[PDB]
Amino acid sequence: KNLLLSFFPILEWLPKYNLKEWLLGDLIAGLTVGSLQIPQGIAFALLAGLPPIYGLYSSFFPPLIYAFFGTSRHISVGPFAVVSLLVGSVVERLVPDDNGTEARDALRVQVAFTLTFLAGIIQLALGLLRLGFLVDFLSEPLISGFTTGAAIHILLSQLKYLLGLKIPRHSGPFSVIYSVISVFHNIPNTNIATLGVSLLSFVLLLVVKELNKRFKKKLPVPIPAELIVVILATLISYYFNLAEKYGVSIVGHIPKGLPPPSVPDLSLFPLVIGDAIAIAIVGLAVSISVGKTFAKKHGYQIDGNQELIALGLMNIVGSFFSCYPATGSFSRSAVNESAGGKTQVAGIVAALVVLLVLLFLGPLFYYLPKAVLAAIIIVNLKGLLMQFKDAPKLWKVDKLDFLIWLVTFLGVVFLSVEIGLLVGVGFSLLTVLLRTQRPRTSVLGRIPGTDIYRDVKQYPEAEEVPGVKIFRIDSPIYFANSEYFKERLKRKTGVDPVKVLAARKKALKKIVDFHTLILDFSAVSFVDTVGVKTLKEIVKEYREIGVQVYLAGCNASVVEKLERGGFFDDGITKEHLFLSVHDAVLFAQARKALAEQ
């Protein structure tokens, strides 16, 4: 049925695939992105603490399962920097670095699989419960700040491998600080051959990227920079024999064959559930952003709920077949699009490229120096570091949107990467309250010879009507701004009804300008519980000094809430609800005349 085809998009979009103007483009794109996934795969695997094959596994399985369940047409899923950073934190925290290496690595990969499992389950859940609207609450400033912060950590991590130092470090509170000073202390312990192969690597990378960018096409497929750098460097470190002589650290044994089916031991569930929640939220945020970017630009739509289901299935399947959490990324996605990716056929093609390297090529990457992997990670990190361009832009336009960006970024650099995200998100939510908490109240008068009413301060043309004081709040009346409203009503109408009643009673036991306040509720989007209580109070007080309160403006839902909340018995009737300020004004004047006689 339509349910089965919507819960497995492949069965809808694959039959309609036109093999003539697309298949060429998707195969080019697949080869381009596979050439990119192999080096980065292994890189991002080291950054995460796991052995190097996990990057090849994470680059093979995820993109397939997403091709099946996925709605986006330009996203490439796989191992991406920030998630790898988060997985790494948890691994090295639950398995410190202290036969021995294989024992530690076995426990490491078990922690990884638990993280992948839980992160997939959370994402799957959210998508089944149709809570995919909550990925809108993750502002773009929030996510810019968080990814830029996380790229500062990932840059500092890869300095140690790039020089050849053997520094231990942490990801805990203020860890970047003592990590950078740790590297400044140990810079005399620099391996010189490791700095050699690092700088050689960067030179070849920038040369090939600039060359294939500026120089002539003469190619259906672009020049794969990272691949050829890994290849030249592994050959150089095998011939000149860097590993054993000069002491340059190399990638270990990469085992041949398909992944082994494994089981995430949920014995570690209470240790890792917190960081699995952070992985899951980061993954959704980044992947769905990218989905939406390319969907907007190419004139189609993604479903946020089906996207959550797809990413969750991909992680859970992967958890079973020896992977770590994948996600989409704007880099691979841009590369996949610029190469001429049209469907998820490109994802399937790229995964077959990683498959043939898992199976055959395999242990030729024995003599690959870890410095060439660190250099690849630093040149990929350009993307996220160029987002510092966004702190001035936000600054100019909206300063609360610039604070979301700064709080999140500082929170991520100079505390934890989990805590950064949490504090950022909280601040993001609070900015809506700070926008609505001192709203813009006004006293309105009639423009002469027109039956429109506008602010009397801002439009000096407008004159107040005799006997009728009209006031207009331009916000919801809720818990955040309701005391304020009642204050500003008593200050801009120039009357406090309880003080006036006190003076009247004092004078009567010893022995106001207006007869009608019209509240214009055109901009009251909603009222909550405190709101209805505050409006009850205002009406009761102004009944006591003998002033009718008419509402002129109320939307349907605000009238229904006022009614449930019991606003329509204490003096006010539903016949004091008018459509526009004018209709209330007329009615007010008329009652006054008919009562004069």
Ligand X SMILES: CCCCCCCC/C=C/CCCCCCCC(=O)O[C@H](COC(=O)CCCCCCCCCCCCCCC)COP(=O)([O-])OCC[N+](C)(C)C
Site residues for ligand X, 275-294, by CB under 6 A, read: 281, 284
Binding status of residue 438 toward ligand X by CB under 6 A = yes
Region for 72 from its dihedrals, namely left if φ exceeds 0, alpha if ψ lies in -120 to 50, beta otherwise: beta
| Closest of 370, 325, 368, 346 to residue 79, by C-alpha | 325
- The single residue among 13, 395, 479, 484 that binds ligand CLR, judged by CB under 6 A, is 395
Contact 220, 397 (CB under 8 A): no
What does 209 bind: ligand CLR, ligand X, its own copies, none (CB cut-off 5 to 8 Å by kind)? ligand CLR
Beta carbon of residue 72, minimum distance to its own copies (angstroms, whole number): 19
| Closest of 531, 544, 533 to residue 503, by C-alpha | 544
Contact 516, 589 (CB under 8 A): no
Neighbours of 490 (CB within 10 A): 16
Number of residues engaging its own copies in binding (CB under 8 A):
84
What does 281 bind: ligand CLR, ligand X, its own copies, none (CB cut-off 5 to 8 Å by kind)? ligand X
Contact 213, 207 (CB under 8 A): no
Pick between residue 525 and residue 580 the one whose CB is nearest to ligand X: 525
What does 135 bind: ligand CLR, ligand X, its own copies, none (CB cut-off 5 to 8 Å by kind)? ligand X
Strand order in the sheet with 468-474: 453-455, 440-446, 468-474, 516-520, 548-552, 577-578
Distance between CA atoms of 320 and 120, rounded to whole angstroms?
A: 11
- Site residues for ligand CLR, window 184-213 (CB under 6 A)? 202, 206, 209
What does 533 bind: its own copies, ligand X, ligand CLR, none (CB cut-off 5 to 8 Å by kind)? its own copies
Pick between residue 169 and residue 533 the one whose CB is nearest to its own copies: 533
Spell out, one character per residue from 506 to 525, where the chain touches its own copies: x when CB under 8 A holds, - when not.
Answer: --------------xxxxxx
Residues 6+ away with beta carbon under 8 Å from 563? 574
Beta carbon of residue 137, minimum distance to ligand X (angstroms, whole number): 7
The C-alpha angle with vertex 147 and arms to 38 and 431, in degrees rounded to 5, equals 155
Instruction: Identify the three-state secondary structure at position 516.
Output: strand
What does 306 bind: ligand CLR, ligand X, its own copies, none (CB cut-off 5 to 8 Å by kind)? none
- The maximal CA–CA distance of the chain, rounded, in angstroms, is 113
Neighbours of 430 (CB within 10 A): 15
Binding status of residue 440 toward ligand X by CB under 6 A = no
Binding status of residue 271 toward ligand CLR by CB under 6 A = no
Binding status of residue 457 toward ligand X by CB under 6 A = no
Instruction: Identify the three-state secondary structure at position 410.
Output: helix
- The single residue among 352, 391, 422, 523 that binds ligand CLR, judged by CB under 6 A, is 391
Beta carbon of residue 440, minimum distance to its own copies (angstroms, whole number): 3
- Site residues for its own copies, window 490-509 (CB under 8 A)? 502
- The single residue among 96, 260, 261, 299 that binds its own copies, judged by CB under 8 A, is 299
Binding status of residue 156 toward ligand CLR by CB under 6 A = no
Spell out, one character per residue from 359 to 388, where the chain touches ligand CLR: x when CB under 6 A holds, - when not.
Answer: -------------------xx--x--x---
What does 203 bind: its own copies, ligand X, ligand CLR, none (CB cut-off 5 to 8 Å by kind)? none
Pick between residue 262 and residue 580 the one whose CB is nearest to its own copies: 580
| Closest of 582, 523, 496, 584 to residue 548, by C-alpha | 584
Task: Give the pairing type, strands 516-520 and 548-552.
Answer: parallel
Beta carbon of residue 475, minimum distance to its own copies (angstroms, whole number): 2
Number of residues engaging ligand X in binding (CB under 6 A):
6
- Site residues for its own copies, window 526-545 (CB under 8 A)? 526-533
Contact 286, 143 (CB under 8 A): yes
Pick between residue 143 and residue 279 the one whose CB is nearest to ligand CLR: 143
- The single residue among 38, 48, 135, 323 that binds ligand X, judged by CB under 6 A, is 135
Pick between residue 362 and residue 565 the one whose CB is nearest to ligand X: 565
Phi and psi angles of residue 229, each rounded to the nearest 5 degrees, phi first? -65, -50
Distance between CA atoms of 471 and 288, rounded to whole angstroms?
A: 44
Match 């030179």 to its residue by tokens. 203
Contact 490, 512 (CB under 8 A): no
Match 């690092």 to its residue by tokens. 198
Instruction: Identify the three-state secondary structure at position 578.
Output: strand
Task: Give the pairing type, strands 77-78 and 327-328.
Answer: antiparallel
- The single residue among 5, 24, 106, 134 that binds ligand X, judged by CB under 6 A, is 134
Candidates 55-63, 67-75, 375-383, 452-460 — which segment interacts with its own copies by CB under 8 A? 452-460
Binding residues for ligand X, rule: CB under 6 A, are 126, 134-135, 281, 284, 438
